[PDB]
Design a protein around this ligand. Structure first.
Ligand SMILES: O=C(O)[C@@H]1CS[C@@]2(c3ccccc3)CCC(=O)N12
Ligand SMILES: O=C(O)[C@@H]1CS[C@@]2(c3ccccc3)CCC(=O)N12
Lengths: 274, 274, 280, 279, 279
């Protein structure tokens, strides 16, 4: 019974739209999206799925109750300055642009109507398989039900919890960038499998199934990841030999470095927005 | 309508038993397990689940149609030399000991009855959440239906495919050791999340959800993991900055090193069995 | 208590660091009188011999005298000296003796073959211990030999439990145990010297920096021994988000700190196997 | 045989430090659990859940803690401090000793905030660690401008009951944080790694954890009880050509010492930043 | 304007190399697709599926390929070779030229296996790469004991139609494998990394891949067409103080050159091992 709109019809808009429609919380036709390049693969794919597509952001705003902002962070202040006169009391504006603060969206839109309902959101592509990791912060004028509607909607395509907005730059470095860390990891493990004699197809399937299963084990365990590592590593065995070589390369510090660098870049993108 | 037995009641026996019973392919009472330390956490846990527990490996052999060998590779030739007179025509002997070849099991058991039906198996702990990665090779006397019964049984707790036996040492390095690589990875990402300001609980949940989701994306995509990495990495963005720092530490080579080292150790354990 | 009234006579062949540590520990525990202990060395000019002499331990340059005095006979010499000792005193081992080898890596099998040429059932126990027995906080393991009676392992556990932790292991674990708890205190002394340098770099007086670093190590170890929790779970509990600790942990990770300790256990274990393999 | 029959203790914050100190104080018998009260904003914390079992009084209102307490521990994150002081600052009284455990938060900043309500607040800055839960903590404290002489002596008496405790100049606390405050986390990492080492060479995990922890425990005790340099204790274990000296070489080859120096330095520098990026 | 009107080609193996060469040969117009036949044990291979679309004749029986072919490419893994030769060795005839593309497999080993059936088998060893699919392959070949002079000339003519091709002594083929045989994979890695570089600095991914590939393409063409040392071409781009020379410094600081040397060396040494661990 809700109308959803996407400004930007790229990778994130499609993932969210595909996830929502797959989840059954939203029918594809209750979704409208608009993009600048009106002939992109994501925009055509939305058409086959049943999403209404348009090149006019104003038409998208006019149709939606909940309006997702799915554009690069530097496009954001132009979208708000271009569509701000079109926001109404009914609108919930959900920003997904990396680093863009609730403050700037609220300051830009307040020039038009004084109590914009803004929610900042950080999600990732696996919403397309309904296994996303999502956090959101509610803005100054976001009503109580607004956070609940947001939590209800995004929980249908993965994990979702509210955070203080000052955690979102860090969450970006962990679960926002996370899937790319996993994709790099899977390509390399596949190279390893292939070096040791496995066909590439089998190596990719096995490496992925292992991560999927391991992550699920942690999610279902009350136990520390180190204790699971302990549980798996038989004395003198193959696994403990492999863990040693990871440690010798500082494997842990590399992933720590990555979360930090992604978080810090997100702060740089936010600080260059002001 | 099948009777299953486990020799060894440790981590792998429990994971498989818990997975099978959770999957509904096997009732807990159609499973019997035996262990040396008859007062271990895994042995007590099997009791609460409904698995029959015993300290006599002979009683386990007498009850089972399918008999899982879930012991360390050096215990294997003593188990076979101790229980070999008890194998019958009905028995399917499924070895899970790392590195132990079908040849040695067939040579040890042939001293008792001449056509032992042996299947070598490589699996991992996530069968406990029915997301295991399993491969198996059928032995000299394994009938046609034997591979099918094996594939049917282990597919119910995760992925399962037949391989040539000479791939299993490599598969061990990839999906056998895989979950421990993931557990180390999740602990470090959690350290990273925590360094950048996230609560530890939230960082573990987000890091795990990200891996679960990313792995599922790869499993459901026809696309190369590099193309998914490309799809996720917006120009100038946080993710591409994080991927750079991974590359600078040779992140890929570390995971390649790990699969290789686990595979090579598995060959060493097999070569020390002979 | 029962070992005191057991009125045991102990001998050490070799009067080096380990003999002194165990003698110091035993006497500190009250299980043994210092004069009911006899030790022997070919060089009477070590400080360890002076400390034993000052303690009241009986000292002699003749190993046979140490064998004749002993009920429990500790072999505390470098792994290559072992077969020359066994050849020299092997005729003197008696049925009453419990022979406890403390040499790194030297197998029970090798000791039994040497001694079986003299008496058919030598009672042999192999031991791996460490210097903190001197403050009764040692880490000790032992494996019982072919002819060790059940009471021999029980007496051994009681004697060594009085100076720290003690448990029986299968013998094929002792090499790994050497690399972990036998060499362990040296890793810790190195770590404490360095943490103290860290303190001094950041402005602490040296005495204070040494004191605090050791107390922290002691307290963390004690927390682990008393906790049912994984050491990583303890790590999380102290590491507040954005905090000082998590920043310090990061730079540890960036140097491969974990892999250095793994390398250390491994190299010590491998060297131990080499020391016996060079006794072939 | 020490016991503070007329002292009331309160904790602002019901996290890790509050629980460790309360468990330590009660373990020592110096304080009854019912004479201790704690407060938290998340009454669904694992530590706050645990505090209920020991018998410590729990409340969600910091004012209730301040009102029931003589000695008030501030066990909150350093950024929470200036909001906490604003909430209860009007409730501080002459009897109160305010003991800050927040990393980096200076005596000056607490005194300036509290002086706005009543002049001469009695403030003591403290740096402690989690092993107070097993009464082997390392604690230092610096006394504020208005803390009487009996104020530090009482705190030393209380904190000596859960481990080592000494007074230091306040400008040592940032470095002490990097050494003994963060110290236990370096040790937990070390014990995990050593146990991985043991497991690689064939030890059961349980045994490897036990032996590694016992070795660290024992060596630390040897150092505390010896008058000798840690290098001299190092020498005693390192028999010529032996197993230990080979392992020491590979530690040296990786710069093991410098890693531990880097860690203390990094924890102290972060502590300075948290203080300076507050003020 | 070249065309082998009386030649029949067969592939044992329907994998990557079979498909690349067949696509290349047909792209050049030198061979009609229906005059080409391939065989595979997995008739559900992506490449074997692709071969059907081009019109190449497909069969699961290696004997059928041998019987229909004049020139027979062995496009199988080096361990499959001695079992393949055992299956069709009795089917080799005087008209046959057997061209091995298996890495490391020596002319000697193929000739010894095939001489057991008919003496004087005509054998040519070949090392090629996947860019033959765009007619820019690098191919070398060594002729066997019984290959007539016209045998190598015919092969050079055929393989020159899909890229560079020259005859070498057989003991160069292991190194050529490490240079040009593995060469394209190093380049694909390089282009992925360069595109990551472009994307980091703000380029769209599509554009970064296009520009990176074009730069590699163009530089390679410059080298092939220039009489000058690659260092001299390097100098021409590196204006004093400029952007390029700063980037060259960071390549040097990571030992970029030595990595590419390590790679050729490692691929050649593995190739030697695969040959020696067969025989
Ligand atoms: O010397 C060594 O490297 C190792 C490490 S522990 C042990 C030792 C214990 C106590 C004091 C001195 C040495 C037992 C004998 C031996 O070889 N050890
Ligand atoms: O000099 C350089 O590092 C860069 C790299 S490309 C360009 C160049 C193109 C062709 C020949 C020489 C230089 C354009 C001018 C300039 O500055 N360039």
């Amino acid at each position: 019974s809700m109308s959803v709109g996407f400004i930007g019809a790229g990778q994130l808009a499609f993932a969210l739209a595909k996830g929502f429609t797959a989840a059954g919380v939203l029918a594809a036709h209750k979704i409208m999206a608009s993009s600048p390049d009106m002939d992109l693969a994501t925009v055509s794919a939305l058409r086959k799925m049943g999403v209404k597509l348009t090149p006019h952001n104003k038409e998208t705003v006019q149709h939606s109750d909940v309006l997702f902002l799915a554009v690069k962070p530097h496009i954001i202040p132009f979208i708000l300055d271009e569509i701000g006169a079109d926001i109404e009391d009914r609108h919930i504006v959900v920003s997904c642009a990396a680093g863009v603060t609730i403050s700037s969206i609220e300051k830009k839109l307040s020039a038009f109507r004084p109590a914009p309902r803004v929610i900042r959101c950080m999600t990732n592509t696996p919403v397309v398989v309904r296994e996303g990791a999502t956090v959101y912060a509610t803005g100054t004028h976001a009503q109580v039900e607004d956070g609940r509607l947001m939590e209800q909607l995004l929980s249908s395509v993965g994990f979702c919890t509210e955070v203080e907005e000052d955690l979102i730059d860090a969450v970006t470095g962990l679960s926002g960038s996370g899937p790319a860390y996993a994709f790099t990891a899977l390509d390399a493990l596949a190279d390893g499998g292939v070096k040791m004699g496995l066909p590439r197809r089998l190596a990719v399937r096995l490496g992925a199934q292992a991560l999927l299963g391991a992550a699920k084990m942690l999610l279902h365990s009350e136990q520390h990841p180190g204790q699971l590592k302990d549980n798996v590593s038989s004395p003198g065995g193959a696994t403990i030999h492999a863990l040693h070589v990871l440690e010798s390369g500082g494997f842990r510090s590399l992933l720590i470095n990555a979360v930090e660098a992604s978080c810090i870049r997100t702060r740089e993108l936010q600080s260059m927005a002001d």
